[PDB]
Tab-separated table of C-alpha atoms and ligand atoms in Angstrom:
chain	number	residue	atom	x	y	z
A	1	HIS	CA	0.000	0.000	0.000
A	2	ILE	CA	3.028	2.377	0.481
A	3	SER	CA	3.664	4.583	-2.583
A	4	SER	CA	6.989	4.753	-4.468
A	5	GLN	CA	6.896	8.534	-3.715
A	6	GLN	CA	6.732	7.773	0.093
A	7	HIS	CA	9.588	5.149	-0.006
A	8	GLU	CA	11.795	7.584	-2.007
A	9	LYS	CA	10.989	10.494	0.372
A	10	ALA	CA	11.698	8.313	3.471
A	11	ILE	CA	15.051	6.985	2.202
A	12	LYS	CA	16.142	10.447	0.992
A	13	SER	CA	15.287	11.782	4.534
A	14	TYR	CA	17.761	9.293	6.163
A	15	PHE	CA	20.658	10.824	4.180
A	16	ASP	CA	19.266	14.393	4.721
A	17	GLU	CA	19.042	13.910	8.532
A	18	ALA	CA	22.643	12.600	8.612
A	19	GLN	CA	23.609	15.956	6.912
A	20	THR	CA	25.428	14.095	4.104
A	21	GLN	CA	24.988	13.342	0.363
A	22	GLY	CA	24.539	9.747	-0.694
A	23	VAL	CA	22.860	6.870	-2.503
A	24	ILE	CA	21.727	3.357	-1.692
A	25	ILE	CA	21.383	1.008	-4.671
A	26	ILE	CA	19.311	-2.143	-4.139
A	27	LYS	CA	19.133	-5.064	-6.560
A	28	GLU	CA	16.090	-7.369	-6.769
A	29	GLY	CA	16.872	-10.042	-9.344
A	30	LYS	CA	18.231	-8.120	-12.350
A	31	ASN	CA	16.490	-4.779	-11.430
A	32	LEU	CA	18.581	-1.993	-9.830
A	33	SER	CA	16.727	0.594	-7.715
A	34	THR	CA	18.507	3.827	-6.762
A	35	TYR	CA	17.446	5.693	-3.575
A	36	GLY	CA	18.843	8.501	-1.416
A	37	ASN	CA	19.457	12.248	-1.608
A	38	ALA	CA	22.185	12.425	-4.338
A	39	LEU	CA	21.111	9.953	-7.069
A	40	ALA	CA	23.840	11.096	-9.546
A	41	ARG	CA	26.444	9.377	-7.271
A	42	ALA	CA	25.207	5.957	-8.652
A	43	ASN	CA	27.568	5.967	-11.714
A	44	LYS	CA	30.436	8.075	-10.278
A	45	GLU	CA	33.823	6.479	-9.424
A	46	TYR	CA	35.256	6.477	-5.882
A	47	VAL	CA	38.103	4.608	-4.230
A	48	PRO	CA	36.707	1.273	-2.869
A	49	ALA	CA	38.685	1.815	0.408
A	50	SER	CA	38.019	-1.150	2.857
A	51	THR	CA	35.318	-2.717	0.615
A	52	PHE	CA	38.391	-3.964	-1.370
A	53	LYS	CA	39.043	-6.319	1.629
A	54	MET	CA	36.382	-8.648	0.101
A	55	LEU	CA	38.297	-9.011	-3.167
A	56	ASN	CA	41.721	-8.908	-1.426
A	57	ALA	CA	40.599	-11.957	0.708
A	58	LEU	CA	39.224	-13.855	-2.356
A	59	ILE	CA	42.539	-13.295	-4.262
A	60	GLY	CA	44.683	-14.289	-1.247
A	61	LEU	CA	42.725	-17.460	-0.429
A	62	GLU	CA	42.446	-18.582	-4.107
A	63	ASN	CA	46.196	-18.105	-4.689
A	64	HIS	CA	47.201	-19.855	-1.378
A	65	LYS	CA	48.696	-16.665	0.125
A	66	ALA	CA	46.792	-17.474	3.370
A	67	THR	CA	44.377	-19.940	5.022
A	68	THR	CA	41.181	-19.078	6.970
A	69	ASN	CA	42.745	-20.255	10.298
A	70	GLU	CA	46.153	-18.566	9.732
A	71	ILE	CA	46.993	-16.074	12.505
A	72	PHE	CA	48.627	-12.881	11.148
A	73	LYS	CA	50.874	-11.733	13.993
A	74	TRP	CA	50.895	-8.095	15.155
A	75	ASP	CA	54.478	-6.762	14.526
A	76	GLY	CA	54.464	-4.897	17.868
A	77	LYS	CA	54.380	-1.439	16.237
A	78	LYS	CA	51.839	1.217	17.308
A	79	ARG	CA	48.567	1.217	15.304
A	80	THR	CA	45.932	3.948	14.812
A	81	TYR	CA	43.457	1.740	16.802
A	82	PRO	CA	44.205	-0.422	19.901
A	83	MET	CA	42.001	-3.305	18.662
A	84	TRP	CA	44.410	-3.661	15.672
A	85	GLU	CA	47.355	-4.247	18.037
A	86	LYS	CA	46.802	-7.998	18.126
A	87	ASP	CA	47.206	-11.258	16.184
A	88	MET	CA	44.261	-12.108	13.949
A	89	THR	CA	42.874	-14.279	11.164
A	90	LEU	CA	41.610	-12.782	7.870
A	91	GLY	CA	38.035	-13.143	9.229
A	92	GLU	CA	38.836	-11.223	12.426
A	93	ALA	CA	40.704	-8.584	10.363
A	94	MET	CA	37.601	-8.326	8.077
A	95	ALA	CA	35.251	-7.627	11.092
A	96	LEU	CA	37.732	-5.143	12.625
A	97	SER	CA	38.610	-3.814	9.125
A	98	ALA	CA	42.327	-4.026	10.179
A	99	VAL	CA	44.270	-2.507	7.220
A	100	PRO	CA	47.768	-3.869	8.222
A	101	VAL	CA	46.616	-7.518	7.861
A	102	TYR	CA	45.148	-6.823	4.411
A	103	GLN	CA	48.288	-4.857	3.406
A	104	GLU	CA	50.335	-7.963	4.426
A	105	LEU	CA	48.008	-10.157	2.309
A	106	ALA	CA	48.372	-7.720	-0.667
A	107	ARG	CA	52.213	-7.832	-0.284
A	108	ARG	CA	52.108	-11.708	-0.266
A	109	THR	CA	50.056	-11.664	-3.507
A	110	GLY	CA	52.483	-9.116	-5.014
A	111	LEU	CA	51.892	-6.421	-7.687
A	112	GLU	CA	52.026	-8.700	-10.795
A	113	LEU	CA	49.485	-11.289	-9.514
A	114	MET	CA	47.284	-8.616	-7.853
A	115	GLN	CA	46.980	-6.658	-11.152
A	116	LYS	CA	46.261	-9.884	-13.150
A	117	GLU	CA	43.559	-10.937	-10.618
A	118	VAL	CA	41.945	-7.469	-10.360
A	119	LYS	CA	41.831	-7.381	-14.227
A	120	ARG	CA	40.491	-11.007	-14.345
A	121	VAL	CA	37.553	-10.238	-11.987
A	122	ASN	CA	37.068	-6.889	-13.786
A	123	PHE	CA	36.700	-4.891	-10.544
A	124	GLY	CA	35.855	-1.182	-11.064
A	125	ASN	CA	38.323	0.635	-13.347
A	126	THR	CA	40.672	-2.458	-12.819
A	127	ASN	CA	43.802	-0.142	-12.396
A	128	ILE	CA	46.047	-0.810	-9.365
A	129	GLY	CA	49.118	1.201	-10.497
A	130	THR	CA	52.599	0.529	-9.022
A	131	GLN	CA	51.982	0.378	-5.198
A	132	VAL	CA	50.601	-3.048	-4.105
A	133	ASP	CA	49.804	-1.937	-0.480
A	134	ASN	CA	47.575	1.164	-0.912
A	135	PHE	CA	46.003	1.204	-4.430
A	136	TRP	CA	42.477	0.636	-3.008
A	137	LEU	CA	42.895	3.420	-0.398
A	138	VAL	CA	44.293	6.422	-2.342
A	139	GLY	CA	43.833	5.378	-5.978
A	140	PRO	CA	44.295	4.647	-8.869
A	141	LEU	CA	41.687	1.902	-8.210
A	142	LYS	CA	38.133	3.290	-8.413
A	143	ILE	CA	34.633	1.799	-8.612
A	144	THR	CA	31.050	3.060	-8.897
A	145	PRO	CA	28.158	2.207	-6.509
A	146	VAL	CA	26.448	0.352	-9.455
A	147	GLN	CA	29.673	-1.716	-9.912
A	148	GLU	CA	29.824	-2.357	-6.095
A	149	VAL	CA	26.194	-3.646	-5.893
A	150	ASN	CA	26.924	-5.883	-9.002
A	151	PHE	CA	30.080	-7.185	-7.269
A	152	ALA	CA	27.970	-7.938	-4.095
A	153	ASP	CA	25.387	-9.697	-6.348
A	154	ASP	CA	28.152	-11.819	-7.972
A	155	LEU	CA	29.660	-12.786	-4.587
A	156	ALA	CA	26.233	-13.559	-3.019
A	157	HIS	CA	25.480	-15.931	-5.946
A	158	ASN	CA	29.038	-17.426	-6.244
A	159	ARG	CA	29.344	-15.943	-9.767
A	160	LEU	CA	32.843	-14.461	-9.302
A	161	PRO	CA	35.702	-16.296	-11.136
A	162	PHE	CA	36.965	-18.102	-8.007
A	163	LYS	CA	36.396	-21.582	-6.528
A	164	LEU	CA	33.003	-22.003	-4.764
A	165	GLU	CA	34.980	-22.799	-1.534
A	166	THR	CA	36.971	-19.490	-1.853
A	167	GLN	CA	33.714	-17.470	-2.179
A	168	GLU	CA	32.042	-19.389	0.718
A	169	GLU	CA	35.117	-18.750	2.954
A	170	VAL	CA	35.026	-14.959	2.322
A	171	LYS	CA	31.194	-14.790	2.679
A	172	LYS	CA	31.461	-16.399	6.187
A	173	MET	CA	33.732	-13.409	7.153
A	174	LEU	CA	31.052	-10.882	6.172
A	175	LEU	CA	28.070	-11.637	8.503
A	176	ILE	CA	27.387	-8.331	10.330
A	177	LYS	CA	23.724	-8.586	11.492
A	178	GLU	CA	20.734	-10.923	11.968
A	179	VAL	CA	17.249	-9.260	11.871
A	180	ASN	CA	14.260	-11.668	12.351
A	181	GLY	CA	15.100	-14.502	9.882
A	182	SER	CA	17.210	-12.252	7.588
A	183	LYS	CA	21.043	-12.282	7.570
A	184	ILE	CA	22.995	-9.179	6.535
A	185	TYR	CA	26.410	-9.748	4.918
A	186	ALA	CA	28.386	-6.575	4.200
A	187	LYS	CA	31.704	-4.709	4.276
A	188	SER	CA	32.013	-1.030	5.117
A	189	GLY	CA	34.564	1.388	3.628
A	190	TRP	CA	35.841	4.853	4.572
A	191	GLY	CA	38.190	6.581	2.122
A	192	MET	CA	40.170	8.694	4.627
A	193	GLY	CA	43.135	9.276	2.275
A	194	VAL	CA	41.037	11.082	-0.386
A	195	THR	CA	39.209	14.454	-0.535
A	196	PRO	CA	36.182	14.386	-0.212
A	197	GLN	CA	36.065	11.257	2.010
A	198	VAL	CA	33.854	8.439	0.666
A	199	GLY	CA	31.755	6.135	2.894
A	200	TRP	CA	30.564	2.672	1.743
A	201	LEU	CA	28.438	-0.248	3.007
A	202	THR	CA	28.227	-2.976	0.358
A	203	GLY	CA	26.672	-6.380	0.759
A	204	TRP	CA	23.453	-8.358	0.589
A	205	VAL	CA	20.482	-9.486	2.637
A	206	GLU	CA	19.939	-13.258	2.727
A	207	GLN	CA	16.213	-13.679	3.508
A	208	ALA	CA	14.855	-16.756	5.426
A	209	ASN	CA	13.489	-18.218	2.117
A	210	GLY	CA	17.003	-18.085	0.551
A	211	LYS	CA	16.484	-14.959	-1.627
A	212	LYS	CA	19.580	-12.697	-1.820
A	213	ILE	CA	19.078	-8.914	-2.096
A	214	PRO	CA	22.361	-7.067	-2.841
A	215	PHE	CA	22.880	-3.411	-1.889
A	216	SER	CA	25.520	-0.669	-1.963
A	217	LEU	CA	25.354	2.473	0.130
A	218	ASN	CA	27.729	5.282	-0.898
A	219	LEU	CA	27.947	8.690	0.793
A	220	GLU	CA	30.328	11.497	1.725
A	221	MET	CA	31.888	10.969	5.218
A	222	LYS	CA	32.068	14.344	7.031
A	223	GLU	CA	33.946	15.774	10.082
A	224	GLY	CA	33.158	14.004	13.367
A	225	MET	CA	30.662	11.664	11.655
A	226	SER	CA	30.250	8.224	13.280
A	227	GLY	CA	30.991	5.131	11.147
A	228	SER	CA	27.671	3.619	12.390
A	229	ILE	CA	25.634	6.161	10.308
A	230	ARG	CA	26.359	3.960	7.214
A	231	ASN	CA	24.840	0.934	9.040
A	232	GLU	CA	21.933	3.032	10.453
A	233	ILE	CA	20.952	4.480	7.027
A	234	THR	CA	21.285	1.025	5.375
A	235	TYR	CA	19.147	-0.803	7.977
A	236	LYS	CA	16.462	1.960	7.941
A	237	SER	CA	16.384	1.887	4.096
A	238	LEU	CA	16.126	-1.965	3.944
A	239	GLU	CA	13.436	-1.952	6.690
A	240	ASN	CA	11.464	0.849	4.898
A	241	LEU	CA	11.349	-1.264	1.691
A	242	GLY	CA	10.360	-4.411	3.644
A	243	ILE	CA	13.652	-6.231	2.742
A	244	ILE	CA	14.245	-6.828	6.507
B	301	9CP	C1	38.625	1.090	5.244
B	301	9CP	O1	38.036	1.799	4.426
B	301	9CP	N1	39.450	1.594	6.192
B	301	9CP	C2	40.071	0.741	7.252
B	301	9CP	C3	39.459	1.116	8.596
B	301	9CP	N2	38.114	0.539	8.741
B	301	9CP	O2	37.160	1.468	8.166
B	301	9CP	S1	35.665	0.817	7.732
B	301	9CP	O3	35.107	0.188	8.896
B	301	9CP	O4	34.899	1.921	7.244
B	301	9CP	O5	36.065	-0.102	6.719
B	301	9CP	C4	39.422	2.621	8.789
B	301	9CP	C5	39.257	3.046	10.219
B	301	9CP	C6	39.530	3.486	7.784
B	301	9CP	C7	39.665	3.053	6.339
B	301	9CP	C8	41.041	3.466	5.729
B	301	9CP	N3	40.991	4.329	4.727
B	301	9CP	O6	42.095	2.984	6.148
B	302	9CM	C1	35.335	2.029	15.962
B	302	9CM	C2	36.274	1.144	15.192
B	302	9CM	C3	35.865	0.258	14.285
B	302	9CM	C4	36.876	-0.597	13.568
B	302	9CM	C5	36.835	-0.407	12.030
B	302	9CM	N1	35.727	-0.834	11.440
B	302	9CM	O1	37.762	0.124	11.414
B	302	9CM	N2	38.102	-0.387	14.254
B	302	9CM	C6	38.469	1.013	14.368
B	302	9CM	C7	37.703	1.377	15.628
B	302	9CM	N3	38.213	0.156	16.354
B	302	9CM	O2	38.306	-0.143	17.746
B	302	9CM	S1	39.367	0.769	18.621
B	302	9CM	O3	40.529	-0.018	18.640
B	302	9CM	O4	38.712	0.627	20.015
B	302	9CM	O5	39.328	2.144	18.306
B	302	9CM	C8	38.567	-0.873	15.441
B	302	9CM	O6	38.829	-2.034	15.687
């Protein structure tokens, strides 16, 4: 009974109230629906930032650069965040979004193999340049929100060019929330090394019946903004549309 006009107004209001500019793209089957307060962001390129952890993990696991139980030791050097000053698996580093572990994984893969794999999966603009440890954080690698929701759709359905086991292993690392009978799998991103700063939340909802609904939220992260606003806008948008 709720009008399209009302759903669009409600979702736009979530971005407006957060005093930011953003989009949330939802995919139902092959149909992409764009919502939010800055719809033109849908086909614009931004650094993937920490959302690249999903592809970094797939590449690393497929090419035997790590195992899912392997403990990446903390080197003992000071980190930006105290929770990163510990030993962790790829899964733990995914949940904590610990950059040093994923920079170690990128270094193990190496520039030549990383570029070949990024080109093979056809991720975003597919350019990683000459620095294997920061290309997803400060460029040249860029991707659009439409490309991110299509990547999430491919991963959710095991359509990426990796072993089924590799995709299942990475998907297990991405469970962030359980609402009723729905499971939310996603990875956030915050491009802190670029101006303006981009904020992402890309993933999918696995409904009780087995249906997978991919999504990609993309917005501008502003001064003193909490990371949780990406999760709050996403959950409110998915709940408004009856996805959760
Ligand atoms: C990812 O974009 N990162 C790593 C880390 N986690 O942020 S996230 O939860 O939004 O992924 C962070 C604090 C910032 C950011 C970065 N550019 O290093
Ligand atoms: C809020 C945090 C979330 C998380 C992330 N998603 O990047 N990071 C950074 C900070 N945090 O915990 S801290 O060590 O207590 O700051 C940590 O593990």
